[PDB]
Amino acid sequence: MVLSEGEWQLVLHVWAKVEADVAGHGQDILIRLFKSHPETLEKFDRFKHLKTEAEMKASEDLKKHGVTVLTALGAILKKKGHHEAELKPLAQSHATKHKIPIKYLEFISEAIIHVLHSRHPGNFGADAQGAMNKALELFRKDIAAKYKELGYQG
Ligand code: HEM
């Protein structure tokens, strides 16, 4: 796939709003993912035990991980499609160490779009949401292709 420049602009314009509060968005997004798809919490041997949303909100470790995830995702989006380098180490650890199925990257893509929609309705109308979905599908497609080369296509 190839996004046009206008689509990238819509993606980087709402992302600049996320970046005003990286740790708060990270929390929202991971909690929305775990609530929606509790099976994904099992992949975290660190958080696994968190039983409620209140516990999740209070977990300092969870919030740090959220900042890690978003920082890496933001560095990938800012490349505007030229992200091969950034993807390599990410696809190797998720395919060999963590073992995250493509299906779970779709689930978090959904949680990212839900949260931007709630927190930025004015910078996240239909065209901007289509552009963000297109940028995340691109991301999932390049990752999936690297999974296959690494031997996982999981
Ligand atoms: C936008 C998608 C994602 C990005 C950009 C991302 C990024 C990262 C980064 C940068 C790290 C630390 C470095 C590393 O281990 O590679 C990480 C660790 C991890 N990620 Fe991903 N991740 C994403 C999605 C997921 C999803 C969907 C899950 C599972 C449901 C997941 C599970 C984990 C786990 C198990 C770790 C290790 C956490 C800890 O033990 O420290 N990741 N991820």
Domains and CATH numbers, the chain: 1-154 (1.10.490.10)
CA dihedral in degrees (82, 88, 89, 93; nearest 10)? 130
The residue contributing the CA closest to ligand 1 atom 9 is 69
Q: Name every residue whose Cβ is closer than 8 Å to that of residue 41 and which is 6 or more positions away in sequence.
A: 34, 47, 48, 50
Return d(Cα 108, Cα 55) in angstroms, integer.
20
Ligand 1 and 30: CB distance under 6 A: no
Tokens of 36: 């929606």
Tokens of 61: 């470790």
Q: Distances in Å between the alpha carbon of 147 and those of 14, 58, 73, 91, 98? A: 29, 34, 17, 6, 12
Experimental method: X-ray
Return d(Cα 42, Cα 35) in angstroms, integer.
12
Q: Which of 100, 116, 136 to mutate to test the pocket of ligand 1 (most atoms within 8 A of CB)?
A: 100
Return d(Cα 27, Cα 34) in angstroms, integer.
11
The residue contributing the CA closest to ligand 1 atom 24 is 105
The residue contributing the CA closest to ligand 1 atom 12 is 68
